[PDB]
Structures are given as C-alpha cells and as structure tokens.
Design a binder for this molecule. Structure first.
Ligand SMILES: *[C@@H]1O[C@H](CO[C@@H]2O[C@@H](C)[C@@H](O)[C@@H](O)[C@@H]2O)[C@@H](O[C@@H]2O[C@H](CO)[C@@H](O)[C@H](O)[C@H]2NC(C)=O)[C@H](O)[C@H]1NC(C)=O
Ligand SMILES: *[C@@H]1O[C@H](CO[C@@H]2O[C@@H](C)[C@@H](O)[C@@H](O)[C@@H]2O)[C@@H](O[C@@H]2O[C@H](CO)[C@@H](O)[C@H](O)[C@H]2NC(C)=O)[C@H](O)[C@H]1NC(C)=O
Ligand SMILES: *[C@@H]1O[C@H](CO[C@@H]2O[C@@H](C)[C@@H](O)[C@@H](O)[C@@H]2O)[C@@H](O[C@@H]2O[C@H](CO)[C@@H](O)[C@H](O)[C@H]2NC(C)=O)[C@H](O)[C@H]1NC(C)=O
Ligand SMILES: *[C@@H]1O[C@H](CO)[C@@H](O)[C@H](O)[C@H]1NC(C)=O
Ligand SMILES: *[C@@H]1O[C@H](CO)[C@@H](O)[C@H](O)[C@H]1NC(C)=O
Ligand SMILES: CCN(CC)/C(C)=N/[P@](C)(=O)OC
Ligand SMILES: CCN(CC)/C(C)=N/[P@](C)(=O)OC
Lengths: 530, 534
C-alpha cells in the first residue's frame, strides 16, 4: 500500500489514487461524500453532513453527476458534449474531490475551491475541462471541487415553506466549504487561505457566497470568471419562483398547499422533473434558466445589487473577467437565424426578433432602447454587423455589464479588484469562426489542459496556459496576480483598467464596454421603474 | 430728368428705385415697397390687408423700418451680436419688401430668389447688412426679393379661435409678399413661374411651413432651408400653450383690469405701447431655457392643418426640389444665452454639474427620465468629467435637438416621398469672425458667404473667401435656375434616406460624406418621442 494515498478525515478513512502528469505525479481523492444522499424524503431539503463511516471509502474515481438536463442541440459535437455529463446521473451526487501534490505537502498549502457553472441547471466536477492535476502539479496548491444539486433538485422553491425552501444547491456548496475548513488540513491544505473560483453560474455562486455572511467566513479570496450574482439570470423573485414550482407540479400531474404539492413532487422519478424543466419559463428566450437562486431574505437578505451597494469590502481581493465574445454561444439556442453550421448572417427582421428573445420579459419601450443603442444607423441592415450586435446585446446584458457593475462597486468600496478580458481563440476550438472567443473557453487554459500531451495545443498555447496558471495561483497565494515584466494594475471605478489575456504580453486597456454598460447599468433600470 | 430703368409700375401704382453700385457693376434696387396696409392701432394682431392702390410715384429708395422687436443686450457693442440687431427705426408700420434686379432690366423672364430672414420669430429684418442682395444679383443675374414680416407678439401672439388675434399673422405677412411677387415680379423682369424660397433659422422654418400650407405652396417652386426646419421643438406651439402665453402677457401688462372675453382682452392689448409688450415678452416662457421663443407659429388647424411632423409624414412631394443644410456647430451660439458656465469671453470649460444643469436648460420641459436619456447618450463614460468634452457635448445637445436632427428628419422624409434633396454641412469659419474659437462655425455664419458679402470692398475677407463666396452663390443660383446646384468638377449627389449623402462646404473642393449625425438623430427622431408617450 501507498501511505501517501491514505487519509483520515473527520468522518472516516479514505483511499486515493496517484495520477500522472507530464511534470510528475499528483495525489487525487475523488468522490468523497460530504453530505447524506438527498434522496426520497430529503429531495428539495437542505443537505445534512455525512454521517461517519467504518472501513475505507474508495476515493479513486469520480462519483455520479447530479441529475440534470442533457443537451441535444448538436448530438456528438465536441463543443457541446464537453459540458454534458460524463458519469451516471443520480440524486446521490453530493461528493467532492481533492487534488494535492505528491508527496502530500507537509506545510500548509493554499487551497483553491472550484464551483462549476451550467446555468444552475447542469454541470459536474468530473468534466475533463475541470481536471485539476495540471494546476496542482504546476503551482503546488491544494484544489477542491464539489458537486451540488442543480435544476429543480437544487433550486425549486416554494418560498416560506419548509418542504422546499429553495437555494439548497447553494447550501450544498456551503457545506462543502465547511467540509474544507474541517478536513483540508489532513491533505496538507491551509484552511486559513481558501480562494473560491468559478465560471458562469459558478462565478455567480462565488459572488453569492461573498454576500451571504454564513458563507463569507469560509473563504478569503474570490475569482469570478464570466459571471456575477447581480445578473438578470442568476436570481429570481419569490413570486416567480413560486409560479415556476407550481407550474412544474401541474406539468407532472401534481397534486393528485405546499406540503401536499411537494409530497407529490417527491414521488416523481428524477427524469420526469427534468423532462418538463424548460417549459416553466415565461417566454421563448436565451440565457434564461428555470430554477436559479431565489431572493427570499435568508441566504440573500436582499437582492445582490442591493447587497453589493451596501457592503463594506475592505480587505477583500477579487479577480474578475470575461471572454471576448460572451454572447455568441447562447445565440444558437434560440435566436432566429443562428446556427453553428453557417455564417449566421441574419437580417434586420431577425435581429429585431432576436432582441426580444435575448432581452426577454421587457417592455416594448425598453426593447426599442436596446435596438437604438445597438443599431449602426449608417449600416442599419448589414447582416455581419447585426450578427455581432445581437451577440453584444446578449453578452453585455447577461455577463459583461453585470461583471463591470460588480467590479466598479467593489473597487469603489474598499476591495482590490483585478480585471481581465480573455482574447485567445484556442486552435482546437470546434465552434465556427464567427463566434470568436466564446463563453467558457478560457477554462481549459486556466486548468492547464494544453499541457496534456494527448491533446493538440500548440507550444505557444502551452506557454500561455502556464502563464495563466501562475496568475491565478499568485492571486490565491497573495491576493495579487502579478509576478514580482508588464504589470497588471488594479481595476478602479474611475480608471477602469483591465488587461487582455492572449499570446501577446499583457496590455492594459480602459473600460469594460463603458458606453454599452452605462445603458444597462445606469439608464435601463430607471426606465423600467417608470 | 428721369432714368427709365429705375421706374416701374406695379398693380398698386408707380415706383421709383435707385441704381446700386457693386464691384461687378450696377444693380437696380427697389427698397421699401409697401405690400400691406400698416398693421397699426385697430389692425394690430390682425391678418394683413393688401396695400391699397396709390397715385403718384412711391420712392422705393431705402430700406423701411424694422418691425417692432426686442433688442439684444447680452454683449453691448459686440460685432457678433450687433450684426443681428435692428439697423433701422423700430415701428409697427413695417410691412415693406425689397426687389433687386440686374441693370439694365432683364429682357427675358429671370428666376426669382425670395429671402425670409430668421431671428427666432422674435427679431430680424431684411435691412441687415448681411442680407444685402446686390452681390447675388450682380454675380448670378437673378431677381432677389426680401420682405419684412411681423415678429414677437405683433406677429405671433395667438388666442386660438378668436378673430381678434388668430395667430400666425407673421406667416400671413410672408404669404402676402409671395402673392405680391406672383402679381408684380414680371414688371421687374422676374419669372413668376420660377420662384425659389430660401431662408435661415426661423426663416428656414418659415419656408418649410409654406411648403406644408396648400395656399402658400402654389406661390413658389423650389425651397432652400438653411439651419432650420418647421418640425423643430421651438418653431411651433400648441393651441393651449399659445393661449397660456398670450393670456400671461396680457396679465403682465394689466389686461384685463386674467383671460375672460377674448375681444376685450385683445382690445386692451392694443392700447398698450409696443415697447410695453416687448418688455415682458421673455417672461411668458414656461421655463428658463435656451433656443426657446415666446411667440412662434401656432398649430391651429388653419395655416397648418396639423403638426409639421404629421404633414411631413403624410405629404406627397413629387415635383419638388429642396436644398437643406446646417453649419458645423449649430448649438454653440445659443449656449451663452443661459447655459451655466458659458461665456464668449472665456473658454467655457464647464464642470459635470454645470453640464447636467445645462441639459435641463437646453432640453426644457421634458421628464427627468428623458433628460437622463440625453445624459446617457452624450456622456463619454470613459471621460465623464473632462471639461472640454462636456462643452462640446452640450453644444451638440442643443444643436442636434433644435437644428441638425429636425433638418435630417425633414430631408429624409422629403427624399423618401418624391422630392429631390441636396444636403450640405457648412464648415468654414470666416477669418473675420468675432466669436471665440471654441464656438467653431456658429449658427448663422454661412449667410454672409451666400449673399457674397466678402465681395464688399469695405470688408477684409481673404481672396480665398471671395472665391468661396462666388462658388456658393453659383450653387444657390444653379439650384434656383435648374433645381440642381451642379454646374451644367466634383459632383454634388442627391440626399436619400438610405445613402444619406451630403457635401462639406469650405475652402477645399466638395467632399461627399454620409449621415447627418445619424447616431445622434436616431435618438432624437426615433426613440425620444416613444419615451415621451410613456
Ligand atoms: C443558418 O442556419 C439557420 C438554421 O438552419 C439549420 O442549420 C442548417 C445548416 C440546416 O441544417 C437547416 O436545416 C437547419 O434548420 C437558418 O435558420 C433557419 O432557416 C430556416 C429556413 O431556411 C427556417 O425554417 C428555420 O426556422 C431557421 N432556424 C432558426 C433557428 O431560426 C438560417 O437561415 C441560416 N442562415 C443563412 C442561410 O444565412
Ligand atoms: C365678448 O365681448 C364682445 C365685445 O363686447 C362689446 O364691447 C364691450 C367693451 C362692452 O361694451 C360690451 O357691452 C359690448 O357688447 C362681444 O361682441 C359684441 O357682442 C355684442 C352683441 O352682439 C355687440 O356689442 C356686438 O355684436 C359685438 N361687438 C364687438 C364684437 O365689438 C362678444 O359677443 C363677447 N363674447 C362673449 C362670449 O361674451
Ligand atoms: C466664464 O464666464 C462665465 C460668465 O461670467 C461673465 O464672463 C466672464 C468672462 C467675466 O466677464 C465675468 O465678470 C462675467 O460675469 C462664468 O459664469 C458666471 O460665474 C459667476 C461667478 O461664479 C456667477 O456669479 C455667474 O452666475 C455665472 N454666469 C453664468 C451664466 O453661469 C464662468 O464661471 C466663467 N468660467 C471660468 C472663469 O472658468
Ligand atoms: C396541507 O394540506 C393537507 C391536505 O389538505 C392538510 O391535511 C394539511 O394539514 C395541510 N398542511 C399544512 C401545514 O397546512
Ligand atoms: C478692415 O481693416 C482696415 C484696416 O486694415 C480697417 O480700417 C477697416 O475698418 C476694416 N474694415 C472692416 C472691419 O469692415
Ligand atoms: C459551463 C459553461 N457554460 C456552458 C458553456 C455555461 C452555460 N456557463 P454559465 O452557466 O452560463 C450561464
Ligand atoms: C439670424 C440668425 N440668428 C441669430 C444668430 C438666429 C437666432 N437665427 P434663428 O431664428 O434661431 C432660432
């Protein structure tokens, strides 16, 4: 036996596995149970800590994926299948994973905690693009990821009720963070140096832990990639959450009050709920998801926008950023005229129709304001400009401007913020050229996937991945990504400085689409209230 | 004895003129021809009556009085403002017109240019030196007519529905002069079947209203609108707001001893000295502002059967040629009349607080949300507080809202509905300009080049500017003769709703460009009206 892969945590003994890397081995402990399986009567309930066990838990392989919708838009296409579950689906899915260097560190090592995205309806810690072996070998930190409930199982809410309080998927993450505080030292980790990082809904999850006091004490630094808690998609109001929960029950034959409604939902197989998940949305749209965190005064005592404005953020360091073309990926899921298999050169009529699906549940006047700002009135009908304009609409509304607002408010209120735009299109990208650098395609570089010899990244891209891993790990260690070389300056509300990340050296630029984001963050709210 | 070239007979009687000297040769001028009975005493606020025939010879040898009006006092003695102030005595006896014709009189019918001065409908006169018609007539051999029309309350005080003060009588003054041209211009060698209206500022808005009034439309064939349009937010007023302003003016001068019977109210107003009415003219505006004037044309269903925008959108304009344009910096002149932080004597590098305050003065009587939309669009959010950018932004706000975007909307609708449109932007700053450099090419300072003022030997224009003026006079006269400013050489393409082509007018040859501030004017012409409705 290998003593380096035997660990005793508070709940019992674990057996890990030795993983290979072009730079040397790492230790991995995969599929560690941190909660009781939320099954049967425990569906929709907050998680319970895992009860202690006898014997040795086999922690050599990833555990099941939390039950979720499986994408079918392009069957077999690499660009979509890389996000689909690669393990069996189960409601018994509350497991986390620990990667440590080999041999295990004898000194307290900074910890990075990954929260995957997936619009709160999908995702898994077992996806190949989240493989932590290269980060842990290159930068010598402890790396933790957890699975958390998604879709109705994690975020269906009958607000006020005890049978379905909502946000339990977020409590899954918090419980894993508490598990890290109690057990990460047994792997060589330092519980006093924990950096949360996540992408898309994971970034929105990270931001929500920043704004929830019970979570705030479980970590010390935060990285938000292409997501923010204050977007128009990451939260839902109590009334709309209740309406969606009620319509789901109707679509699955329930009831035969909240107590009875939830009891009937608990009798339905997991797939039955998944099969009707998308039909509770109020309208045809993109970048909208059925069951997301709810603002009910508990996990979030107020809206994330209100909490960001009222918060004291001195002593907080955050790393935030976006990719160059945040919106293009979502357009093929419903904007008329868009497809991965052609140039998607849409007409003005399709552009106007696409604005309503990309900015759903918005008055006609506010939609007209969007069309005004995003039309080039010297070329109002040029298909290529319209394709790009609609990508900018979806991307600015949902990612760039929510992130810009978060960064500006945190910086103006005591936090040290570092901002980036990711501008390298991977040579291996399977999405068409017109999508540019699409949403989510900086992750593989952050995790050092180009170092995998089994893949076809260039030598320049391997250098690039090592650069990014160093930035991220420097920030985890010191709150500053810079190597003590062109310097990465902090983002401020006035100067609005960020850096571009690509094969070229760091270049400092001004403004995260300041013109467009003034519209979304300053004017549009004023219009909607009148 | 007498010179036969300076003696002409019109329908009303005989006239005697004068021989003007110009650097290029003699011109015949008939200045101060009465075309209406003096609108004095009981005739104040009433539509004009045609001039009764006279015996003997009327001496049309000098400009007549300026219609009673407010006199600017912002910069006393300053050349930049005094050039617009009355250069003749003020009087309500002011309904006279002027005719310039070549010497000797043309043998064949000659195209006619009719000038309508601006002045915000509260000021102006055809006697101003910058409107001197001798150079145009000499250089291009046209006949030029200009008329005086009543301004201020005397021309546009309206109690709608009352016959005592129906409103728009200043526009009826212009129409009567146009009817006079139809009946009498052939006696001067003019062709009544080739008449081109042209005007600037409120004169351009007047030209546009004649285009949209059927009784006026038959009196001319072509139109030139310089830095003005009838659809601006300042050129017309609703019936109720006209009545509120008229009622408030009478109240401020003691009439009646508020509102009540219209006949008695107007009769009380007619007993007031003309200066007393002028002394309170500016006090009836609903808010402090710039580019807003108290007594302007009223949309009452008569002269204008609807708003100018509705008439423009519903009009068939086939068979019409129009020449429209603006100067490069339309807003700057108006900012020193009330925007906080602005003066001709300093750089006017305003603060953000002064910019935000200026938006409410420059876009008056709109909701807080509408003002926020203006601030969003005209702020550079990468440099939100730089004084120089704020100064230029407020100038653009006032210029786009009041001139550029109204002109662009008119041009686009006319072109899309059968008219042929030629558009320009005037971009030359005169070497003799007295306004400070930060105002650029200000509103109104293309007029002197179109009238050929640089050819005046007493003035100090460069040789290039004299060539420039001669080129502009040729464009205008070519349009008057043929409906096309091009020489029968860089070509001036028509303006269309799609291509939106216009030319730059300056010392360089013609350069073709696209879009009259297309991005800005989409906000003013497409979005903002939808916001005001909700
Ligand atoms: C680009 O393609 C989209 C989607 O078409 C799909 O992909 C093609 C490669 C082919 O497999 C089609 O059969 C697919 O439907 C086009 O948008 C569609 O247009 C058709 C009419 O041709 C219409 O019936 C569908 O409803 C449209 N789909 C959507 C989602 O709006 C689009 O027109 C193409 N762009 C071009 C040709 O410029
Ligand atoms: C509004 O008043 C006019 C004028 O009233 C006349 O003049 C006043 C000074 C006073 O002397 C009144 O007694 C006068 O009647 C009215 O128009 C007059 O109406 C009467 C009866 O027809 C008569 O004097 C003449 O017809 C009109 N004289 C005018 C026009 O000078 C008018 O009817 C009143 N309108 C209303 C709605 O009351
Ligand atoms: C620029 O000037 C304006 C106007 O001031 C006038 O013009 C100056 C050149 C000088 O001749 C002054 O004596 C004149 O009064 C300034 O705006 C005024 O500022 C004063 C003092 O702060 C204030 O009382 C007035 O209300 C202001 N007037 C307006 C219309 O706003 C402005 O401050 C000057 N800007 C500078 C000096 O940077
Ligand atoms: C919910 O409804 C059931 C059936 O009507 C009833 O028996 C039960 O008491 C209710 N529970 C609550 C908490 O209201
Ligand atoms: C032109 O300049 C001369 C001096 O060179 C001056 O005497 C004359 O008054 C000026 N004419 C103007 C300003 O019209
Ligand atoms: C995991 C990254 N992906 C899929 C590409 C998404 C959708 N992230 P995020 O939840 O966008 C809302
Ligand atoms: C005659 C030119 N001027 C004076 C500069 C004006 C104000 N013209 P317009 O009537 O402006 C609304």
């Amino acid at each position: 036996e290998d003593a380096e892969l035997l660990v005793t945590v508070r709940g019992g003994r674990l057996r890990g596995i030795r993983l290979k890397t072009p730079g040397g081995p790492v230790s991995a402990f995969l599929g560690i149970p941190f909660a009781e399986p939320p099954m049967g009567p425990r569906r929709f309930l907050p998680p319970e800590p895992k009860q202690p066990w006898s014997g040795v838990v086999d922690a050599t392989t990833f555990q099941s994926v939390c039950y979720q919708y499986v994408d079918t838009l392009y069957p077999g296409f690499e660009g979509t299948e890389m996000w689909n579950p690669n393990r069996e689906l189960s409601e018994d899915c509350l497991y986390l994973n620990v990667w440590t260097p080999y041999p295990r560190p004898t000194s307290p090592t900074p910890v990075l905690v990954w929260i995957y995205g997936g619009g709160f309806y999908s995702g898994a810690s077992s996806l190949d693009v989240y493989d932590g072996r290269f980060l842990v070998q290159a930068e010598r930190t402890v790396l933790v990821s957890m699975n958390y409930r998604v879709g109705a199982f994690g975020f269906l809410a009958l607000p006020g009720s005890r049978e379905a309080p909502g946000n339990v998927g977020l409590l899954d993450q918090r419980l894993a963070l508490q598990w890290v505080q109690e057990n990460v030292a047994a792997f060589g980790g330092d519980p006093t140096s924990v950096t949360l990082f996540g992408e898309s809904a994971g970034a929105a999850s990270v931001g929500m832990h920043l704004l929830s006091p019970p979570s705030r004490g479980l970590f010390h630094r935060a990285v938000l990639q292409s997501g923010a808690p204050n977007g128009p998609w990451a939260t839902v109001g109590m009334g709309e959450a209740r309406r969606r929960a009620t319509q789901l029950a109707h679509l699955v034959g329930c009831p035969p009050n909240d107590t009875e409604l939830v009891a009937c939902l608990r009798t339905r197989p997991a797939q039955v709920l998944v099969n009707h998940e998308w039909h509770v949305l109020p309208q045809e749209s993109v970048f909208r998801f059925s069951f997301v965190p709810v603002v009910d005064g508990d996990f979030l005592s107020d809206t994330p926008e209100a909490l960001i404005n009222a918060g004291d953020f001195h002593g907080l360091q955050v790393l935030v950023g976006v990719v160059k073309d945040e919106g293009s990926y979502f357009l093929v899921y419903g904007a008329p005229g868009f497809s991965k298999d052609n140039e998607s050169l849409i007409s003005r009529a399709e552009f106007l129709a696409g604005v309503r699906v990309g900015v759903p549940q918005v008055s006609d006047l506010a939609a007209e304001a969007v069309v005004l700002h995003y039309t080039d009135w010297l070329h109002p009908e040029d298909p290529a400009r319209l394709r790009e304009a609609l990508s900018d609409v979806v991307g600015d509304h949902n990612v760039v401007c929510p992130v810009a607002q978060l960064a500006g408010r945190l910086a103006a209120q005591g936090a040290r913020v570092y901002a980036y735009v990711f501008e390298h299109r991977a040579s291996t990208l399977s999405w068409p050229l017109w999508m540019g650098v699409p949403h989510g395609y900086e992750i593989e570089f952050i995790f050092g996937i180009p170092l995998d010899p089994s893949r076809n990244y260039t030598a320049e891209e391997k250098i690039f991945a090592q650069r990014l891993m160093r930035y991220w790990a420097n920030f985890a260690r010191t709150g500053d990504p810079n190597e003590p070389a062109p310097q990465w300056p902090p983002y401020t509300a006035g100067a609005q400085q960020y850096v571009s990340l690509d094969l070229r050296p760091l270049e400092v630029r001004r403004g995260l689409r300041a013109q467009a984001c003034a519209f979304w963050n300053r004017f549009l709210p004023k219009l909607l209230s009148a």
